[PDB]
Symmetry: C5
Subunit: 324 residues, 5 copies
């Protein structure tokens, strides 16, 4: 039973060098706030109890079941699920006692996406590997990350990868932090361009005379089209607790503007049916509406240029597990 | 085989201290009435049979397979599925016999959502860990919960967490109760604002004269838009057996109001085609319809302020498993 | 190897008492004809070989791995998948040899839904636990069901639960039969109310004069709305091989009625464009159409009150596995 | 280690009798070309090494772990995934050495659907169980199929089941072939009836005069409705590599016909706006369009009655695994 | 423990011959950039330690558990998940020491799809099997691929399969490269034909006079139809980081063209309402719009004929794992 026990480095804790290869980051689900990735962990340590004389055994390296010798069990706190692609990994031990273990795992880990500037948003995703069964006085970690992502043509691109060992911890752990940027043009072309086109179409349709019967139907059909587009957007974009994306607010403002234009058109047409004052009011409202649309565009551009989110840290983030 | 047996505390049952860390609550599916969460359970007890003299073994703590020594098997009744993120957990035993076991598990547990006040609804979710293979006279539980949720920017926010050991039980168990509040603005902006806008647009379109050919098409297009919106809402909101959400009733009432307005407009236009009495009837109905819309808004606001649901407890809730 | 063998009761087969607790019935998928449930099975039998003298062993009860002593392996024929929430269950054995085993399992079992009277339909769901590896002369079952469902606020409510041991069987098995009733108002409000409203709107729009240009557009927009609603319904309702739901036939009849009204309106308007006879024909058709709509409503109400389905039993139902 | 080895029948290979019970065929996904089924395999063979004298052991039958004695491992080539509903099956051995093993498995197997005549299409689904670890000179199979399907009220009904052992094979295998017929009326009512109704409505709307302003809007609204219906159909029907369903071609032809009618109406109305020749051309085109619609209906009916698909066999079908 | 060790070929590394049978390629998800396949790997090597004299053991071949003798553990870097359809594979060893192992596995592997020419696009999918626990000086691979795909009637057809052992590698691995071509007509008929039909309909509707009230509604309804179609396309097509499909750009250009036509029509109609110059401007714009539509068609055809994508290789592709 002593073989299964963690090797004793002496007064200092045992040092395990971890090399992390990020094979891919495939699913990035903003709706579920989850990021899916594939990792290869190479864990290397020294176990002098496993060292053998080369004269007795000619082999320079052997393979042993992971349940025979001591292997540090790693658990990811943020991972919704972990799938280890090896049922029973085999640890490779050199003649000097160096033990190297290779683990391939696909993990769906929780990531806090800052979706305020969607679609051009940047987020930080953290994968914290914890050795729950061990203590900091017994185990120490050196984590190195190697960028080996096999796919680059995706909506989200990882552009910064790093590893850190947080100080003042009781449970030994290492955190791999990556930065995700969204470069997908699907959302923009899908929603923003049709929305701007519909808004400009409504602005130009405001030129139609009040007495024309084709103006009301035109405006209402545009309103229905924008209602469909807004429904698609809101069903597509996730809703945060504190910092919702600016796009939903922008589309809500545009929807209210289109509704206001349609209601004004219908009300003034009805009043005129019962240059009269409805026509002058319609012209004044058209000028005011064009000015307001331009002002709304400029104000939202300024907001997008200078918006900030002071999202309060979650209890897990503010007070992480296994510290002090 | 005696090692696998539960330790004997004597006349009193063995005491196990359970510390629960809620890492995240990620999926909250109202349609399926399920809540998905990640938990870390630290179970600590005393096993004097495992105590060893420090002189014989210099190690101050050892790690053993969970199938070697006695580990209490915990089963969650409400959990649709449980995924233990460790294939074979390792129990850490101190020199004095104290055994500590760390279990990381992702569970999809049944939660009874009170959806009457959707979207601003509060619900209670309970996770009941049961030691089915043991009896109350043999095992006792002390459950402590620590709020370590890593994500706060989600639709549902946990704002109250507690643990309890129900009295007069035959199967030892402990229940973790959490409170879920919905702070998502996606539903409101998606549905309520377009619905109110369409209702006000129909009210203002009632101003159009009966003889106008543009009024019927306007009202029917608005009716189609609200039909699409109502279909989206009803396909989005789940249906409870007894207390359905107030939103579906509100949207049904608004849909009936819009249908009544359209049918009145069409009928009176047809009668007029065959100040005449259809025009006076149209004006009277317009006044009555505006008054009725305002009254419906006020009555539903009052209902929302003072609605209650005396939802009868389920047989599992009224008569919980393993009691007396 | 004799311990793993089934205990010998003598000439009579061994008797196993099974207590079934239905924790929840969560997914009821009519489209897939599957019902998902969670069950707790307490299996109790007598094994005199495991009995021990209390003088030798002070323990009054012990726990053993399920692979050490004989445990009856239960297989569900109708279950699409079974998930046993315990990797290795532990059997509790008393000093007298009584063995009790607790198994928690989540099962997706096939259920034959009688969807003729959707949404107010009642169905029978059967879960047949079979001991395939054993014979009837060796194993006997006593099955008891306890209603411990934890959620009652769902679309489908279980209102009758029972257990039975079919006679003249070769493979020992026990069947848990439950009755599912649908109390969801989502389908009704979603589909029936808009359908009736659109039908009545078309009936009232038949009042519009033939020469009016607003009648054709009104009827066609209503037709498009009902086409969308009918598409939503047919994509929502499953299609049985023999007894399809009455709702799809009702909506098809209403869709044909609306198409007939629109085609008549367009044809007579075109003929009139080229009191004339088209107007008299339009009035006669309007009267006939109102009468036909009322007659269709009454006839379908009578059919719903007196419809029956003599659905032929499936080969598995007519000839169940392991009989004679 | 000799117990695990396959029993020696002598010069002839060992004979294993396989009885297959098809409990259900639940998912039949045309889009993924996969069919999901549940099977119970009873494998019986003779192992004289396991025979015991009744005098020494009074038991007439024993149960052994499947990893103790030789059990043929069966692999399905077409199965996307297999789920064995028993973690560790137990083999029942009689006193004479007869070994019977019961395996319950849910499999998602690839099936080549002939979707040319959708929805009234017939397909052949094959499940090939292979003993990869064994050779034909060592193992032989006798496969019998019993129709025990528990659900008959589904879209696809199995009406023919058979088993075969292909000749001239090196890897012992047996193939269960079943015939699937689609009896679902959901697709027909959902798509064909609305399509025919819209086509006839457009034909009747061709009666409207060219100078009428209501004709263009009518035709365009019908065109939009048929566009929505065609989009729903094409997103519903899968696309084969060589033999696509006739329904998509039929709906494409109808969509082109409706577009041609709308374009002709708009062009001639515009030319007339600038009995004149546009009116005579419109009447001639109306007659030609009615004749063409009738001819298209008759030609497609004849094609449906006499269409054939000589789909080239896949490399796996033409050259099956483990032959010669 | 020496049996589990890799056999020693001497100075040269041990040679393992791998035969790969591709049973099927079923899911090809462009949105997730993943390809799902089923493979059968036959791994053959020589282990003289397992050779036995035929005089002692009459058997010419034996079967052993994969955990008894040395079996090379293969890991796929690009595979999102791997499902080995055998819980415990059995290795067949001949009398001369030749060991053959058959592994059936269903894998979802990452594939970089070149979607620039969608739907008629060709892509390369690579499956890299790595022996992480071994070194190149100890293990060598010979990989052979056999095309045994059981389904050919799918959207994506594999038309080229090959195997390669990359040179200058430290971790022994072999790569199976296949070529995927899309032959599905679902996308074309679904989107391109309706888009071209709507564009030509708008072009022909430009013939309508400016003063006509039916022109604006016609153009706006066509615009709404194309908006729905464009939304369906963009929600259907995935978005790459660098080389988006040409279809989304084409549909965006067509949508902008339709919006420009509608805005011009509405603006000039409004100006005319307030041969006049609006009519001459409308005719000139109609000619310019027809010319521009034809020019856009020709330019996009030329682009499609001569477009190229120099997609930069991903860090995993440029620097593959286990080299030098
Ligand atoms: C045992 O503890 C010592 C001290 O922490 C470790 O030695 C350190 O190793 C790292 C990198 O390998 C160096 O950066 C430090 O400078 C070293 N410190 C000293 C005092 O030497 C040693 O690696 C540990 N050995 C094992 C097997 O864990
Ligand atoms: C054995 O039983 C005793 C009595 O229940 C336990 O002692 C109690 O422990 C809790 C907290 O540890 C205290 O709140 C009580 O005051 C204690 N009661 C008494 C009489 O001392 C004891 O913890 C149990 N020991 C084990 C190993 O389970
Ligand atoms: C052995 O067989 C006998 C006879 O079937 C079983 O005794 C019956 O038990 C049930 C309920 O426990 C009673 O309803 C019957 O009246 C009993 N019949 C007789 C003749 O006693 C007995 O339970 C079986 N014992 C075991 C361990 O299986
Ligand atoms: C051993 O081989 C013989 C010959 O194939 C098998 O005997 C045959 O069994 C089948 C059905 O059981 C009969 O249809 C044949 O007529 C039999 N042939 C002969 C020559 O007898 C025998 O079943 C095999 N025994 C075992 C244990 O596999
Ligand atoms: C041991 O190493 C030798 C040399 O690599 C292997 O022999 C080669 O085998 C391949 C195909 O089997 C031939 O193409 C080469 O020509 C052979 N080279 C020589 C020098 O013979 C041999 O296969 C290896 N043996 C084992 C068990 O791995
Ligand atoms: C992400 O982490 C880095 C520190 O490594 C920090 O500078 C940056 O502000 C973070 N970005 C976001 C969007 O949180
Ligand atoms: C939830 O539980 C608390 C008791 O802890 C209770 O006071 C409260 O009424 C419950 N809330 C709901 C919505 O049931
Ligand atoms: C369900 O089973 C009961 C018998 O327990 C039977 O009386 C009833 O007719 C069945 N109901 C249906 C809808 O099949
Ligand atoms: C299916 O298999 C049978 C032979 O058993 C064959 O006669 C028939 O033509 C096949 N049907 C189809 C649609 O391939
Ligand atoms: C795919 O791989 C082959 C080499 O085998 C190469 O010639 C070809 O250009 C590649 N095709 C694509 C689309 O990358």
């Amino acid at each position: 039973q002593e073989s299964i026990q963690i090797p004793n480095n002496g007064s200092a804790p045992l040092l395990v060098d971890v090399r992390v290869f990020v094979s891919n980051v495939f699913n990035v689900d903003i709706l579920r706030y989850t990021m899916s990735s594939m990792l290869l962990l190479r864990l290397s340590w020294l176990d002098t109890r496993l060292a053998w004389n080369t004269s007795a055994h000619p082999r320079h390296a052997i393979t042993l079941p992971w349940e025979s010798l001591w292997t540090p069990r790693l658990t990811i706190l943020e991972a919704l699920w972990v799938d280890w692609r090896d049922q029973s990994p085999q640890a490779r031990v050199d003649q000097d006692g160096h033990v190297k273990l290779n683990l391939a795992l696909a993990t769906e880990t929780n990531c806090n996406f800052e979706l305020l500037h969607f679609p051009r948003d940047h987020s930080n995703c953290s994968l914290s590997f914890y050795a729950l069964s061990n203590t900091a006085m017994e185990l120490e970690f050196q984590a190195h990350v190697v960028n080996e992502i096999v796919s680059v043509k995706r909506e989200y691109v990882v552009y910064d990868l790093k590893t850190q060992v947080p100080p003042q911890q009781l449970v030994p752990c290492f955190q791999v932090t990556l930065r995700l940027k969204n470069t997908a043009l699907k959302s923009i072309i899908a929603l923003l361009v049709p929305a701007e086109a519909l808004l400009l179409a409504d602005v130009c349709g405001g030129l139609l005379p009040l007495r024309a019967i084709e103006r009301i139907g035109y405006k209402v059909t545009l309103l229905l089209s924008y209602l469909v587009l807004h429904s698609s957007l809101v069903q597509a974009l996730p809703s945060s607790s504190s910092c919702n994306p600016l796009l939903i607010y922008y589309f809500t403002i545009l929807l209210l503007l289109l509704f206001l234009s349609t209601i004004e058109t219908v009300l003034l047409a009805g009043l005129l049916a019962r240059r009269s004052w409805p026509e002058t009011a319609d012209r004044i409202f058209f000028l005011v509406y064009v000015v307001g649309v331009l002002c709304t565009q400029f104000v939202f551009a300024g907001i997008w240029m200078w918006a900030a989110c002071k999202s309060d840290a979650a209890p897990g983030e503010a007070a992480p597990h296994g510290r002090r």
